[PDB]
């Protein structure tokens, strides 16, 4: 199955009474694994399989690094705000991570956003940064002048990140590698006079990745299909739906199992 590891860094300038000036959170797939903020000033586990498998020196070491990265983010956001002639509260975001695909091939990404919009995107294949505007271009030139740092980031995304992900996947295998098949049903109802709505609803499934579609006489629909978001049910499982207006069948694919519900 496809898995991913990613670490986010969020900086907010001039924050309100309760908003932290810096937050860092780690994820393995959709699961939070780590947290840090400018209020606690401590890196902490956010999954019991993280807490149990990483010794206290891991949290002590990363607490120090994150205190440093928080300071660096404060300065970077001051510099960015000066480049744009911005005042007031602005945000800076970083996302680094990797994916280990089902076929054994990998992906890696390192991106920055300013005020929640794409700002700088690293291309680990040409060792270059893609800049959205002249301000991002100024930063891009400085980063691109440091060849060793580009090579280090490529090595991190391609080797270290994947090794961390495989380690974490083993720690939380009972959660991340389990499968809870969906409970699926088709509901029929006359809505507006002469308009019959068909809802194919799924719930209780894990992983959240599901494929749902409506077919007509075995062939794909050309009519409008409405899709529900894949939502957390709060118990570790997910729910989703697909609807059409009316031989119809709902097709559901989840973790290598296909299901058909003929109306």
């Amino acid at each position, epitope marked *: 199955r496809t898995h991913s590891l990613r670490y986010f860094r969020l900086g907010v300038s001039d924050p309100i009474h309760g908003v932290p000036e810096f937050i860092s959170v780690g994820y393995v797939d959709s699961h939070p694994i780590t947290t840090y903020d400018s209020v606690t000033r401590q890196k902490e586990p956010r999954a019991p399989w993280m807490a149990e498998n990483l010794a206290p020196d891991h949290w002590e*070491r990363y607490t120090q690094l994150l205190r*440093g990265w928080q300071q660096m983010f404060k300065v970077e956001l001051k510099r960015l705000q000066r480049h744009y002639n911005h005042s007031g509260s602005h945000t800076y975001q970083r996302m680094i991570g990797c994916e280990l695909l089902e076929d054994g091939s990998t992906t890696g990404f390192l991106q920055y956003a300013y005020d929640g919009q794409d700002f700088l995107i690293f291309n680990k294949d040409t060792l270059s940064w893609l800049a959205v505007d002249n301000v991002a271009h100024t930063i891009k030139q400085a980063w691109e002048a440091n060849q*060793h*740092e580009l090579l*280090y980031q490529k090595n991190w995304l391609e080797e*270290e990140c994947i090794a961390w992900l495989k380690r974490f996947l083993e720690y939380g295998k009972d959660t991340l590698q389990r499968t809870e098949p969906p409970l699926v049903r088709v509901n029929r109802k006359e809505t507006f006079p002469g308009v019959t709505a068909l809802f194919c609803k799924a719930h209780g499934f894990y992983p959240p990745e599901i494929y749902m579609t409506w077919m007509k006489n075995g062939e794909e629909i050309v009519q409008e299909i409405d899709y529900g978001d894949i939502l957390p049910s709060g118990d570790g499982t997910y729910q989703a739906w697909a609807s059409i207006e009316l031989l119809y069948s709902c097709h559901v694919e989840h973790s290598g199992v296909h299901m058909v519900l003929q109306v």
Partner: antibody
Framework: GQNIDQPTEMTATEGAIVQINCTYQ??????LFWYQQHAGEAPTFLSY??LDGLEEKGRFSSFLSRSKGYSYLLLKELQMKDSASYLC??????????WGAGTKLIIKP | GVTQTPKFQVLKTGQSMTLQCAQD?????MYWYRQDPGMGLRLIYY???????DKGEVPNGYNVSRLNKREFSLRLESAAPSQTSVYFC??????????????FGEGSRLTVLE
């Protein structure tokens, strides 16, 4: 990580070539540095490698093989002024440096 | 770049000592190492940035203060003969996360005698 090994000492002739090896066994890899340290002086940065290949800076070149877990520092056209200790250091998974015990290089005039 | 003091010092066991280190390179991380024959540099304490410090591999008998971004002092509260060593202060542009090299001070030779 855990261990970094480099020879204690090496002797070579002025005008010739010397290769200083550094092997490492670590929990993660984020780069390998070489420092020069003249007797009684501070260490000074010489090179950095993190991907496979050889990089050259003047008479000094630094190689890395990630799969064999080793690097070498190669000095060409040896001069008396190259008499010094050469320190190998590796950055582990937690971005911590692990230092080799250094190699003292002796040049025979 | 890195200014370290003193170059030499003789101490009697039990005496206190403060080693000074300053850098004007706007570096974030500062480190205190000891260098002993037949072994690699050993980290005593370090400071990832202004406002934080933490133990290295050999912190027993020492403490540090990150006074500001520029300065990182090393203190021997009660000097012991085993602390006879060569002390190196070092700094890096950012934290250990990166490819950045260390910049070393000139070294401080301390001899602790009964």
């Amino acid at each position: 990580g855990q261990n970094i090994d480099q020879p204690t000492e090496m002797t070579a002739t002025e005008g010739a070539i010397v290769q200083i090896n550094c092997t490492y066994q670590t929990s993660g890899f984020n780069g390998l540095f070489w420092y020069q340290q003249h007797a009684g002086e501070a260490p000074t940065f010489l090179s950095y490698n993190v991907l496979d290949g050889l990089e050259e800076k003047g008479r000094f070149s630094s190689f890395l093989s990630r799969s064999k877990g080793y690097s070498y520092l190669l000095l060409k056209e040896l001069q008396m002024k190259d008499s010094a200790s050469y320190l190998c250091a590796v950055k582990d998974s937690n971005y911590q440096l692990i230092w080799g015990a250094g190699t003292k290089l002796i040049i025979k005039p | 770049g890195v200014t370290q003091t003193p170059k030499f010092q003789v101490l009697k066991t039990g005496q206190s000592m403060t080693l000074q280190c300053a850098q004007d390179m706007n570096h974030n991380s500062m480190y205190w190492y000891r260098q002993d024959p037949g072994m690699g540099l050993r980290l005593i304490y370090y400071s990832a940035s202004e406002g934080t410090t933490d133990k290295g591999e050999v912190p027993n008998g020492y403490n540090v203060s990150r006074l500001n971004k520029r300065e990182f002092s090393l203190r021997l509260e009660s000097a012991a003969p085993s602390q006879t060593s060569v002390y190196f202060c070092a700094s890096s542009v950012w934290t250990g996360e990166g490819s950045g090299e260390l910049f070393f001070g000139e070294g401080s030779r301390l001899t602790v005698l009964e």
